[PDB]
Design a protein around this ligand. Sequence first.
Ligand code: NA
Length: 330
Amino acid sequence: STGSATTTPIDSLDDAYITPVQIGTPAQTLNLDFDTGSSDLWVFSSETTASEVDGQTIYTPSKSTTAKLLSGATWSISYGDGSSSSGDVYTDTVSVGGLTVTGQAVESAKKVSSSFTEDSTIDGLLGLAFSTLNTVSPTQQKTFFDNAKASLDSPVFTADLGYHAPGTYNFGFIDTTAYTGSITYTAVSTKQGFWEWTSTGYAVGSGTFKSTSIDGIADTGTTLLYLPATVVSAYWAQVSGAKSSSSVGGYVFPCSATLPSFTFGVGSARIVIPGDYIDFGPISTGSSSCFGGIQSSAGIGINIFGDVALKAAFVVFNGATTPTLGFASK
Ligand code: NA
């Protein structure tokens, strides 16, 4: 089997992407944030504290003929941005882009933090990191990908995120029409439960490529590119008037600037992030200070190849017995 679903930016900045997901019988369609940096499929629900719901579509298990309480199971998760959610668990039928899994753990939120409530466009998360990170207790649950894997034509999914445009998540196949050139595959460590890999270096604009190992994770659920402070300083030094602002929480730059591209290495291959991808617009409405899309990972404890990086590539998440990542230009 295969599946193919379109993923759509939630706003004009590509702050996140939502993908429609069918849950239950009859189907309840919720728009979920597919997150290769976490391993829980959780949803706003009929159980969510009413004051914490503001515009989201909810899953109502009582209206699904295939829903069953997973008795005793609870979940609770905290993300890198400080957001959180928790609740109980049902199993139900979940379909993505025509690919169906029966018996998927659907984590029903009883509580969500303010950032979730305030985002009316995201109805929950669908985790695509390794199932070792899943938070369900006392019986850890599998991700949608891990449950689908054995049925797929190939044990893979691909992320093809758009810049200010829709893109695609495919399950079970490579769309050879969706990228240019060849795919370069690179090793993955699953030791921390992430799609963790090592980039071979970087370049700023038209500058020379710096060969250096950068360990980080491929994380579709993170908006920005978080890299070591040395790398990030080297990038923003090429933008007149850019500076790190402790008050704003990262590098800012004049909205009048034209940003240089950023290149990262994948083995001997190179992915180029156009400068425009690194502009996250005014820090507050009407400001002439703009927020940068490349930020320091110092204090986060890991480098993160978030959407800024991933949307410059066609990315293969190879879940074969030895997982690997692939990157192609597009
Ligand atoms: Na922000």
